[PDB]
Amino acid sequence: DIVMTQSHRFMSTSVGDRVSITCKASQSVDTAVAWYQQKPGQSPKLLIYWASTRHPGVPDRFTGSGSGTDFILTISNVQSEDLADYFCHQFDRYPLTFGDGTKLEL
Amino acid sequence: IEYRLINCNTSACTQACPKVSFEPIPIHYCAPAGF
Amino acid sequence: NPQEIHLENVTEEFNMWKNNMVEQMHTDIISLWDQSLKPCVKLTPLCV
Amino acid sequence: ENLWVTVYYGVPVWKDAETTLFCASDAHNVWATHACVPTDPNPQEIHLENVTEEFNMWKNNMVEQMHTDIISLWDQSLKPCVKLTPLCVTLQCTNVTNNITDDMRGELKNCSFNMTTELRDKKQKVYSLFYRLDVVQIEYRLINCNTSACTQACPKVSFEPIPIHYCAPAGFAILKCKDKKFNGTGPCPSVSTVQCTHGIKPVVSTQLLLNGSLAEEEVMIRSENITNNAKNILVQFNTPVQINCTRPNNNTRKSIRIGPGQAFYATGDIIGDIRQAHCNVSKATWNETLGKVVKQLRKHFGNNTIIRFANSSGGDLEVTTHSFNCGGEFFYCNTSGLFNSTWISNNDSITLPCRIKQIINMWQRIGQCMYAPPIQGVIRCVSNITGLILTRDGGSTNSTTETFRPGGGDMRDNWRSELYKYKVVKIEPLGVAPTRCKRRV
Amino acid sequence: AVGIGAVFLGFLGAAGSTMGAASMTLTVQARNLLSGIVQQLTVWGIKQLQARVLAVERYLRDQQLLGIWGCSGKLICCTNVPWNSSWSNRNLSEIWDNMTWLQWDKEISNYTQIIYGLLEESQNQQEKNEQDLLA
Amino acid sequence: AVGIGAVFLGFLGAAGSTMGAASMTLTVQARNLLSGIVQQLTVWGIKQLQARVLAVERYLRDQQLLGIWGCSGKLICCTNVPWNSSWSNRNLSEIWDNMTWLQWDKEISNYTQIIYGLLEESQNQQEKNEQDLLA
Amino acid sequence: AVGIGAVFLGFLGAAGSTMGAASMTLTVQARNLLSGIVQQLTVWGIKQLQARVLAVERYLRDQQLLGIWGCSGKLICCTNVPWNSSWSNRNLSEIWDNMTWLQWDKEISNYTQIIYGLLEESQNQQEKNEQDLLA
Amino acid sequence: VQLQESGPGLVKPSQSLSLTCSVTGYSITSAYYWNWIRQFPGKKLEWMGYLLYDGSTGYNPSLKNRISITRDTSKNQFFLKLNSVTPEDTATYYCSREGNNRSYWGQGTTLIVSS
Amino acid sequence: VQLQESGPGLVKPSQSLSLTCSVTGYSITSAYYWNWIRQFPGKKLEWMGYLLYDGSTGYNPSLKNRISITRDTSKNQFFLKLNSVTPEDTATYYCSREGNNRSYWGQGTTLIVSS
Amino acid sequence: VQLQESGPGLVKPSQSLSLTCSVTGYSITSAYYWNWIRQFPGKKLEWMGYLLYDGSTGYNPSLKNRISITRDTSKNQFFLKLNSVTPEDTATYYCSREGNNRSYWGQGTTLIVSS
Ligand SMILES: *[C@@H]1O[C@H](CO)[C@@H](O[C@@H]2O[C@H](CO)[C@@H](O[C@@H]3O[C@H](CO[C@H]4O[C@H](CO)[C@@H](O)[C@H](O)[C@@H]4O)[C@@H](O)[C@H](O[C@H]4O[C@H](CO)[C@@H](O)[C@H](O)[C@@H]4O)[C@@H]3O)[C@H](O)[C@H]2NC(C)=O)[C@H](O)[C@H]1NC(C)=O
Ligand SMILES: *[C@@H]1O[C@H](CO)[C@@H](O[C@@H]2O[C@H](CO)[C@@H](O[C@@H]3O[C@H](CO[C@H]4O[C@H](CO)[C@@H](O)[C@H](O)[C@@H]4O)[C@@H](O)[C@H](O)[C@@H]3O)[C@H](O)[C@H]2NC(C)=O)[C@H](O)[C@H]1NC(C)=O
Ligand SMILES: *[C@@H]1O[C@H](CO)[C@@H](O[C@@H]2O[C@H](CO)[C@@H](O[C@@H]3O[C@H](CO)[C@@H](O)[C@H](O)[C@@H]3O)[C@H](O)[C@H]2NC(C)=O)[C@H](O)[C@H]1NC(C)=O
Ligand SMILES: *[C@@H]1O[C@H](CO)[C@@H](O[C@@H]2O[C@H](CO)[C@@H](O[C@@H]3O[C@H](CO)[C@@H](O)[C@H](O)[C@@H]3O)[C@H](O)[C@H]2NC(C)=O)[C@H](O)[C@H]1NC(C)=O
Ligand SMILES: *[C@@H]1O[C@H](CO)[C@@H](O[C@@H]2O[C@H](CO)[C@@H](O)[C@H](O)[C@H]2NC(C)=O)[C@H](O)[C@H]1NC(C)=O
Ligand SMILES: *[C@@H]1O[C@H](CO)[C@@H](O[C@@H]2O[C@H](CO)[C@@H](O)[C@H](O)[C@H]2NC(C)=O)[C@H](O)[C@H]1NC(C)=O
Ligand SMILES: *[C@@H]1O[C@H](CO)[C@@H](O[C@@H]2O[C@H](CO)[C@@H](O)[C@H](O)[C@H]2NC(C)=O)[C@H](O)[C@H]1NC(C)=O
Ligand SMILES: *[C@@H]1O[C@H](CO)[C@@H](O[C@@H]2O[C@H](CO)[C@@H](O)[C@H](O)[C@H]2NC(C)=O)[C@H](O)[C@H]1NC(C)=O
Ligand SMILES: *[C@@H]1O[C@H](CO)[C@@H](O[C@@H]2O[C@H](CO)[C@@H](O)[C@H](O)[C@H]2NC(C)=O)[C@H](O)[C@H]1NC(C)=O
Ligand SMILES: *[C@@H]1O[C@H](CO)[C@@H](O)[C@H](O)[C@H]1NC(C)=O
Ligand SMILES: *[C@@H]1O[C@H](CO)[C@@H](O)[C@H](O)[C@H]1NC(C)=O
Ligand SMILES: *[C@@H]1O[C@H](CO)[C@@H](O)[C@H](O)[C@H]1NC(C)=O
Ligand SMILES: *[C@@H]1O[C@H](CO)[C@@H](O)[C@H](O)[C@H]1NC(C)=O
Ligand SMILES: *[C@@H]1O[C@H](CO)[C@@H](O)[C@H](O)[C@H]1NC(C)=O
Ligand SMILES: *[C@@H]1O[C@H](CO)[C@@H](O)[C@H](O)[C@H]1NC(C)=O
Ligand SMILES: *[C@@H]1O[C@H](CO)[C@@H](O)[C@H](O)[C@H]1NC(C)=O
Ligand SMILES: *[C@@H]1O[C@H](CO)[C@@H](O)[C@H](O)[C@H]1NC(C)=O
Ligand SMILES: *[C@@H]1O[C@H](CO)[C@@H](O)[C@H](O)[C@H]1NC(C)=O
Ligand SMILES: *[C@@H]1O[C@H](CO)[C@@H](O)[C@H](O)[C@H]1NC(C)=O
Ligand SMILES: *[C@@H]1O[C@H](CO)[C@@H](O)[C@H](O)[C@H]1NC(C)=O
Ligand SMILES: *[C@@H]1O[C@H](CO)[C@@H](O)[C@H](O)[C@H]1NC(C)=O
Ligand SMILES: *[C@@H]1O[C@H](CO)[C@@H](O)[C@H](O)[C@H]1NC(C)=O
Ligand SMILES: *[C@@H]1O[C@H](CO)[C@@H](O)[C@H](O)[C@H]1NC(C)=O
Ligand SMILES: *[C@@H]1O[C@H](CO)[C@@H](O)[C@H](O)[C@H]1NC(C)=O
Ligand SMILES: *[C@@H]1O[C@H](CO)[C@@H](O)[C@H](O)[C@H]1NC(C)=O
């Protein structure tokens, strides 16, 4: 039972600011951490795999980093199409466990 | 119409090769290897 | 010598009207009926 | 201490060998004939990193496989039709004056002949309308009467191109390239494997490629050694250029039988007005697409050169003009309005006149036919232009101010833009490796 | 390591992996040498039969040749044929864990015949040696 | 053991037999997988050729997985893979003599793919373990 | 014994030699049992396919019959079953050095069905004894 | 690959919930992981269980023995059964396929557990 | 299988007794054991001998060399010959099918040995 | 079998001599010995080296390391390369086939080593 505590649930932001999201793991296990993006009325979509690498089609403005118990996702130059929910997840050992979730507001 | 064959408005017939016959010699069906 | 091997102590569910034995042989001798009509000569000028 | 030889069975080893392929299709037609095995719709696309394979189109035998295969699929779908031998009786053709403009003068002929009823002793008087390209003088006779008879191609079937999947049996694999800036030949750093490919449309054309596949990023020019002027420059678009082709004539179908159980659907009288079949393309979109081509064309040549566009170099109508088969009726289109432009460094429709020819010699084989029956009702056709075939003209002085002309004709190049990324390899599972061994005696 | 991190290795997935890492990938390759047309007129009738027999007798060609060497029923076997210094002047550390199988066959493609002939001669050498000690 | 008790098993004669009695009968059910067409135009140029090559491909499919598991050429192969008790909660005395093999295959029809894939995963490990101890 | 005097016997060359001279050439004879048509219309459309599958089925029948006896993968395999001397009352000195395999077949062609059937009953008995002892 | 969920949209409490995932474009007997995932009101996700390519099973312990997951390989379908349902189990149910850095989700279906 | 005995119903003493058993519905050359059994007055049964599909013969030793048993495989028939008959050999002669825990008998025929 | 030698008829001193033997009528991957033999002015023969069907190489020691012999099995051709040539190596070069008391020779070609 790795417990993932996220910083905040609702955060207000403006277009053009750098924003950084953080996730804290109960144990220091691995660097194999993934972020998923979920827009309203849509299923979640995988964004980052192995914490530092990008997926095909994902824009360059998305970066991620961290290790141990601390993992930081950074969005830079926020546009309108990035309104969504983001979740820090881990895929090391069963049972799979989800974060609570963070909602972006513009 | 004076008269004509009934299948003249459809494809023409063949006379069934009267050298051979229509008497059914019995056949036997077999399964292949593994069946 | 049609070797028939009796199997006792066994049961099986037979299902007629759905086997491919009936369906194939209906298709099989239709192909055997059209094949023997090709060497026969046509009767095209009989429609006078 | 000294090393020893081993045997490994089931090792990935590739050698470039080519064999016959196998058809597959999704869920009666001329292309499939309900005979291909319905493939499972899972092209399992395993990515292979750290590998660079040297792809080479214009030498791939899969292009020559599909050209030969659909010829065998064409004559197979023409056997249960009816032979059109008695259509070489004499004709008495007169021009049509029923609501016709000056542009269609001398194009439709009202003929009459003495074709036979299903009873041999009885004849009939049958009138039909043939195009000017279908009849020749002797009053008139059909063009094919000094060639073999025709087939009429069984109009219950259609000519819509059903996608066809080609994929080899066990022991062979298909590798595909995935480079965004992929040229024709050379190595590919994105080689992956697929057991059985995607849908390939067998649609045929001469000048402009229709209903093809789009490029990834920009308009890509795929050609071998460029100083040949007798070889076709293959250009694939990055955007779809919509083309609007219609036939505005309300055609009817007169079913008059030639013999016992043998029908022949002639053309009835035309109701309404007589008008020209034409193809419409957007002038603003086509000028934008030609702008993207000449930037990529000048990458392979000088920057200060003058690239000039022109029409075809003439010849017979089979190879000079455009061809497509939407709606079931053949269209031969004059494409001199889409290539009248010159280019130097630094309104909603283009009306292309189009002729309609019924009797067709389809491929380069001359001893066959294509008697397309008339289609009842008007024809609506919407398609995308996705490719061009360009032949560079010779006579260039000092390697400057060259011109580009269309062409094609050979059907090899129509599918070279759809099988450019594919190759087939032969797998040997045997191999050897050094490590330390002594057999347990 | 599990979930999205699980590796199923696909088919032909060890083409770019090293020779040492591909020593556990031998199973998935051999299972695709026979199947594929398991679910079903001149066109496309003889084209399957020509391809089906060709896919079988090439597998039997590579399986009979395994049985001549004494490697029947095994995937990774190794004989007593001494491969010598002229064929490849590299140690085992310079072959296994730094390069892959695909271009390894190109240097040995000239020496494939000399390797294959010595293995079938060496197996028949130790068959008669088994006869002497058994009697 | 004679008269009415003699052995005239033939082909498939131990179909309804107990598993202990049918364990002696695996020899006679192997030879009738390729023969029958030992002695000899659109019809039957395909109807005979398609079924003859199918019997070859089904036979080589059964032999090849018997080779991947590492014990090809053996009629009774018993390997070193532990089995999960969730597939069948019956002991040795409740399997081999009280029930017919036909209904047993339906009980393990769902769990066939688990046990068919675990065999070769412990065979490549077996061949890797054989390589370490040999050198 | 070099140059023009070297041994290049090839296929079917040892068919006139003695028993011990022909026993060393079993590799080259079985090499030509599958290949030969490795390089490639109604006529020879069915004849070509019937040519190969007839040849494949005979090779598989020989290997499967060898695999029943437990000699699969071996070229010179020998079992431990006794044979009655009434078939041939000749010692090893008068048979294994002075006669050809061609004239040997006609003297035992009466008893090939008997001597083959004594091999699957022999081979299955060690597997029965292996199951009792090792359990 | 395309995934399509189907089944009854209303289930009475204490009764059994059955859903079908119809899969097209890929064979469930070859590779990867085939999952059921649900989304509660308030946009929270809870993983229920998975399947191996060979038909092996595994479940989230929080669901105890309430879940059996099953499949039909002839129809290329797999199935969810959920015993002893409660109105706090009302949620939108997805069937998803995950692996090899490729994650695909169905469109989902809505279910309400009420009397 | 059906078995039917045939032959002369009266045989003079010291002469030879011949009977035919005609078999239909199954081939005697890929097969079970085919026996002759007779029933004496007073309902006692004595087994004389058998045949095998491979042509091997077996007889009760008590009958010495008095009996040869033979077959015709083209007609699917087998035959009894009994030399040197006595009136104590008078009996109802059956040809029998036995094996695989199955036992089938013909209807039998009557024979009297008298002058 | 037919053998045909080909290559340049004039080679500059100290440069390399290359010749091709094109073989037809027999496969170079099956058996016997494949040799190069040359004849000097004055009718003297000297054996330079051979090949085997399995790719093994052997050379006359008198030629030291001056000779590499190589082949292309796709084209069924084998090749001679001779380094560091001298005018005393001028000769008519044959490719010949030997074994099983068979001996077939090509027609030969003439080469002159001069500047
Ligand atoms: C067709 O049949 C003929 C005759 O039957 C075979 O010819 C020879 O047959 C003999 C009889 O078995 C073989 O036996 C050899 O006898 C040698 C001594 O006998 C004389 O041999 C020759 C005359 O043949 C004389 O020159 C010699 O001086 C002797 O007086 C033994 O020495 C042989 O044993 C071993 O000898 C050397 C030792 O290294 C080996 O090279 C041999 O292979 C062998 O191991 C042997 O016992 C004799 O082998 C046959 N000759 C040949 C050339 O094989 C034909 O061979 C046969 N045709 C075929 C195709 O087999
Ligand atoms: C390139 O691809 C295009 C997209 O498929 C092709 O356009 C299609 O061409 C076919 C001709 O083969 C047209 O089919 C005709 O449709 C009309 C009327 O269509 C109505 O009926 C169909 C069938 O029920 C239905 O699907 C439609 O929605 C309409 O309700 C029929 O009267 C004809 O008999 C014929 O079936 C397609 O309509 C047409 N698609 C569109 C969107 O217009 C194009 O032909 C391809 N290019 C080439 C060169 O082949
Ligand atoms: C000619 O080119 C046009 C491009 O405008 C093709 O239009 C294509 O139309 C289909 C169906 O409407 C589109 O598919 C759908 O796209 C939406 C986009 O969000 C997607 O959400 C759906 O799930 C569905 O996939 C397709 O995208 C569109 N093509 C492009 C490039 O946008 C038209 O089909 C072409 N004609 C031929 C014959 O190829
Ligand atoms: C169908 O079921 C019946 C059972 O009701 C089977 O009868 C069984 O026949 C076998 C014949 O081999 C008997 O085995 C024998 O057992 C004795 C010991 O009693 C042993 O000494 C012999 O060597 C032999 O193994 C078996 O006992 C008998 N079953 C019972 C309960 O007595 C019948 O054969 C079955 N039909 C088949 C298999 O086709
Ligand atoms: C193709 O383009 C031509 C050219 O615009 C169109 O012809 C027009 O047709 C309308 C009838 O609705 C007339 O009112 C216009 O005067 C015509 N234009 C000209 C320049 O004369 C034609 O309709 C187009 N066809 C299609 C199918 O879009
Ligand atoms: C081609 O013809 C169509 C008429 O069918 C023109 O109108 C388009 O029609 C489609 C569907 O009917 C609409 O989705 C488009 O928005 C229409 N276009 C416009 C501009 O309104 C179409 O414009 C013609 N295209 C060309 C290049 O001539
Ligand atoms: C390409 O376009 C040119 C026009 O520049 C065509 O040349 C004309 O051809 C006609 C033939 O009917 C002559 O009457 C004209 O005199 C020609 N024009 C000039 C300026 O000489 C040419 O025929 C076209 N080619 C094709 C294949 O369509
Ligand atoms: C294709 O169309 C063009 C124009 O639509 C034709 O070019 C015309 O040819 C005639 C022939 O003498 C000239 O009088 C005209 O001046 C030309 N038009 C222009 C704009 O210059 C061309 O001939 C047509 N192609 C064919 C093969 O007929
Ligand atoms: C493709 O090549 C890269 C080389 O960079 C491989 O990356 C290595 O992977 C191994 C384990 O998989 C690590 O231990 C190394 O540290 C990696 N980096 C190196 C050698 O620089 C990669 O694994 C290869 N791909 C495959 C599928 O094997
Ligand atoms: C042919 O004529 C017969 C005679 O009445 C009629 O019954 C039949 O329907 C006709 N068939 C066709 C195809 O016209
Ligand atoms: C019919 O059209 C042709 C076309 O050239 C023309 O030569 C002929 O004079 C026309 N006849 C009439 C009567 O209009
Ligand atoms: C058809 O034949 C008749 C009789 O010979 C003739 O009068 C008529 O002109 C012919 N029709 C045509 C179109 O020539
Ligand atoms: C048929 O006649 C026309 C009329 O001139 C000619 O152009 C054509 O070449 C001829 N066809 C053949 C095959 O000779
Ligand atoms: C890609 O194009 C051709 C292949 O036709 C090749 O010769 C060339 O070197 C490649 N690169 C560029 C930049 O053209
Ligand atoms: C064709 O390619 C060759 C390369 O072999 C090149 O030298 C030549 O210039 C190219 N063009 C022509 C016209 O030969
Ligand atoms: C064409 O016009 C005729 C006139 O009678 C009409 O019947 C037919 O429906 C029209 N076709 C179309 C496609 O409008
Ligand atoms: C063709 O001529 C016939 C002669 O009767 C006439 O009925 C028909 O209307 C004409 N058709 C045309 C299109 O001129
Ligand atoms: C088409 O593009 C060219 C590019 O130089 C331009 O000169 C011309 O005016 C454009 N025509 C139209 C109609 O936009
Ligand atoms: C043409 O211009 C481009 C800039 O767009 C430049 O990269 C290229 O080198 C130029 N070509 C030549 C031959 O100078
Ligand atoms: C190209 O179009 C212009 C438009 O005015 C026209 O004047 C010119 O003659 C055309 N050229 C050709 C070759 O058709
Ligand atoms: C090649 O190997 C053989 C034995 O297989 C050995 O005798 C020979 O010396 C080796 N070659 C060299 C150059 O060492
Ligand atoms: C096996 O599967 C079938 C259908 O998939 C099912 O009806 C049966 O209950 C299953 N058996 C077990 C023991 O789970
Ligand atoms: C002797 O040979 C006979 C063949 O008729 C065979 O049945 C018997 O078992 C043999 N005896 C021994 C002891 O091998
Ligand atoms: C075996 O049978 C054949 C043919 O019936 C016969 O020629 C041969 O002599 C027999 N064998 C013996 C040893 O008698
Ligand atoms: C292998 O053979 C080819 C052609 O015979 C040759 O070019 C290449 O150099 C050879 N490789 C080695 C390592 O000798």
GROMACS .gro file of N, CA, C and O in nm, chain I residues 93-111:
model
   76
 1243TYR      N    1  -2.360  -7.813  -3.319
 1243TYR     CA    2  -2.234  -7.742  -3.341
 1243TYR      C    3  -2.257  -7.594  -3.367
 1243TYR      O    4  -2.332  -7.556  -3.457
 1244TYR      N    5  -2.191  -7.511  -3.287
 1244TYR     CA    6  -2.201  -7.366  -3.296
 1244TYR      C    7  -2.067  -7.310  -3.340
 1244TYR      O    8  -1.961  -7.360  -3.301
 1245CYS      N    9  -2.071  -7.203  -3.420
 1245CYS     CA   10  -1.954  -7.120  -3.445
 1245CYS      C   11  -1.976  -6.986  -3.378
 1245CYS      O   12  -2.084  -6.927  -3.389
 1246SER      N   13  -1.875  -6.938  -3.306
 1246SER     CA   14  -1.897  -6.837  -3.205
 1246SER      C   15  -1.801  -6.720  -3.221
 1246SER      O   16  -1.685  -6.735  -3.261
 1247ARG      N   17  -1.854  -6.602  -3.189
 1247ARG     CA   18  -1.779  -6.480  -3.166
 1247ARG      C   19  -1.771  -6.436  -3.022
 1247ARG      O   20  -1.872  -6.412  -2.955
 1248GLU      N   21  -1.645  -6.426  -2.976
 1248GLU     CA   22  -1.604  -6.395  -2.839
 1248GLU      C   23  -1.494  -6.289  -2.840
 1248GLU      O   24  -1.400  -6.299  -2.920
 1249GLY      N   25  -1.504  -6.189  -2.753
 1249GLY     CA   26  -1.392  -6.099  -2.731
 1249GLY      C   27  -1.434  -5.966  -2.672
 1249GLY      O   28  -1.552  -5.932  -2.682
 1250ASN      N   29  -1.339  -5.888  -2.618
 1250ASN     CA   30  -1.362  -5.752  -2.566
 1250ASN      C   31  -1.480  -5.743  -2.469
 1250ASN      O   32  -1.552  -5.643  -2.467
 1251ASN      N   33  -1.501  -5.850  -2.391
 1251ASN     CA   34  -1.621  -5.869  -2.308
 1251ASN      C   35  -1.749  -5.861  -2.391
 1251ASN      O   36  -1.848  -5.801  -2.349
 1252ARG      N   37  -1.746  -5.919  -2.511
 1252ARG     CA   38  -1.863  -5.937  -2.597
 1252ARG      C   39  -1.866  -6.082  -2.641
 1252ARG      O   40  -1.761  -6.143  -2.663
 1253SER      N   41  -1.986  -6.139  -2.654
 1253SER     CA   42  -1.999  -6.279  -2.692
 1253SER      C   43  -2.123  -6.297  -2.779
 1253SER      O   44  -2.235  -6.273  -2.733
 1254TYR      N   45  -2.102  -6.339  -2.904
 1254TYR     CA   46  -2.211  -6.363  -2.999
 1254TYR      C   47  -2.203  -6.505  -3.052
 1254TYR      O   48  -2.095  -6.554  -3.085
 1255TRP      N   49  -2.319  -6.569  -3.061
 1255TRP     CA   50  -2.335  -6.708  -3.102
 1255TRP      C   51  -2.428  -6.715  -3.223
 1255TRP      O   52  -2.522  -6.636  -3.235
 1256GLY      N   53  -2.402  -6.811  -3.311
 1256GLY     CA   54  -2.499  -6.846  -3.414
 1256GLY      C   55  -2.619  -6.921  -3.358
 1256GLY      O   56  -2.625  -6.956  -3.240
 1257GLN      N   57  -2.716  -6.946  -3.446
 1257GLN     CA   58  -2.834  -7.021  -3.405
 1257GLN      C   59  -2.804  -7.170  -3.391
 1257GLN      O   60  -2.873  -7.242  -3.317
 1258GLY      N   61  -2.697  -7.217  -3.454
 1258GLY     CA   62  -2.666  -7.358  -3.441
 1258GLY      C   63  -2.736  -7.444  -3.545
 1258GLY      O   64  -2.834  -7.404  -3.608
 1259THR      N   65  -2.684  -7.565  -3.562
 1259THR     CA   66  -2.743  -7.665  -3.649
 1259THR      C   67  -2.731  -7.802  -3.583
 1259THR      O   68  -2.644  -7.824  -3.498
 1260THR      N   69  -2.821  -7.892  -3.620
 1260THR     CA   70  -2.827  -8.025  -3.560
 1260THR      C   71  -2.761  -8.124  -3.654
 1260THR      O   72  -2.784  -8.120  -3.776
 1261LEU      N   73  -2.684  -8.217  -3.597
 1261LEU     CA   74  -2.616  -8.322  -3.671
 1261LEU      C   75  -2.628  -8.452  -3.593
 1261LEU      O   76  -2.608  -8.454  -3.472
   0.00000   0.00000   0.00000
